[PDB]
A paper describes a structure:
Several natural systems exhibit ‘facilitated dissociation’, in which an effector (E) can bind to a target–host (TH) complex to form an excited ternary complex (THE)20–26 from which the target dissociates quickly. We set out to design protein systems that undergo facilitated dissociation. We use a switchable target binder (host) and a flexible effector that can rapidly bind to and switch the target–host complex to induce a large steric clash with the target, forming a strained excited ternary complex. We show here that by explicitly considering excited intermediate states when designing coupled protein systems, a broad range of facilitated dissociation systems can be designed.
Numbering used by the authors: 1 to 258
Write the structure that this text describes.
């Protein structure tokens, strides 16, 4: 009755947490295990659901469950191995950290990557997370996570291969900048640049005192939503305050190192 026991763990995990994402991942893990005649998929699903009940951090719960679901789907040939590799590397970053910015950033990047099938984009995200894990500097890790997530959002939003290649160049610039000691504000600025280039527009940067103000004209509000999601999450990862203003078709982003 192993598969039914796995389902029981999923029901207790679903009673422990009311979160919609944990409940759906738990339901998917239970169902994939119940549909499997593979005793190793049952083994991983059992242990992932058992650790999920032992962990205190609900964001690490999500990471553990996402990796199990992706592993079960790789066992059925349903998803590319790169998505599992990304989830596992993200889990590795999260388990090495007490900083919830890194834990949440690792999950966001893994979930955003799970939403694209572009092989080129998956390899960029995986290489980014691998470079993060090869770091002792949690400051660099947070910068890389912000860049990887921003890049993955552009892929999910359907940016062209040429624009993703341009965004990938900015990912590399951002990582090199962080290694050289760029400020948190400057790293958030680089994420804005990545999104602006990835959406084919231009930006006008003003630096008054210690603030950075970016005026972006010519974005559709659907593009504005994706850009601001990337930038606001980057600001959370970098511990920087951002304030937004909309005037007409123009978005203005104020970045304060705070």
């Amino acid at each position: 009755s192993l598969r039914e026991e796995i389902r029981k763990l999923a029901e207790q995990l679903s009673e422990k947490y009311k979160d919609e994402e944990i409940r759906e991942l738990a339901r998917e893990a239970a169902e994939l295990a119940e549909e499997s005649d593979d005793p190793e998929v049952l083994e991983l699903a059992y242990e992932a659901l058992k650790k999920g009940l032992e962990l205190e951090d609900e964001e690490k719960v999500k990471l553990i469950l996402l990796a199990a679901v992706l592993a079960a789907r790789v066992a059925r040939g349903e998803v590319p191995e790169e998505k599992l590799e990304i989830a596992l590397k993200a889990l590795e970053l999260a388990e090495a950290s007490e900083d919830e910015r890194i834990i949440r950033g690792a999950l966001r990047a893994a979930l955003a990557a799970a939403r694209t099938d572009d092989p080129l984009a998956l390899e960029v995200v995986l290489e980014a997370l691998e470079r993060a894990q090869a770091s002792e500097d949690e400051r660099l890790i947070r910068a890389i996570l912000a860049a990887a997530y921003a890049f993955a959002l552009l892929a999910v939003a359907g940016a062209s291969a040429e624009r993703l290649k341009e965004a990938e160049a900015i990912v590399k610039e951002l990582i090199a900048a962080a290694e050289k000691g760029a400020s948190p504000q400057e790293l958030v600025l680089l994420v804005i640049e990545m999104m602006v280039k990835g959406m084919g527009v231009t930006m006008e940067t003003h630096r008054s005192g210690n603030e950075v103000k970016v005026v972006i004209k010519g974005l559709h509000e659907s593009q504005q939503e994706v850009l601001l999601e990337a930038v606001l999450f980057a600001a959370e990862l970098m511990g920087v305050r951002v304030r937004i203003r909309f005037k007409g078709d123009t978005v203005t982003i104020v970045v304060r190192e705070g």
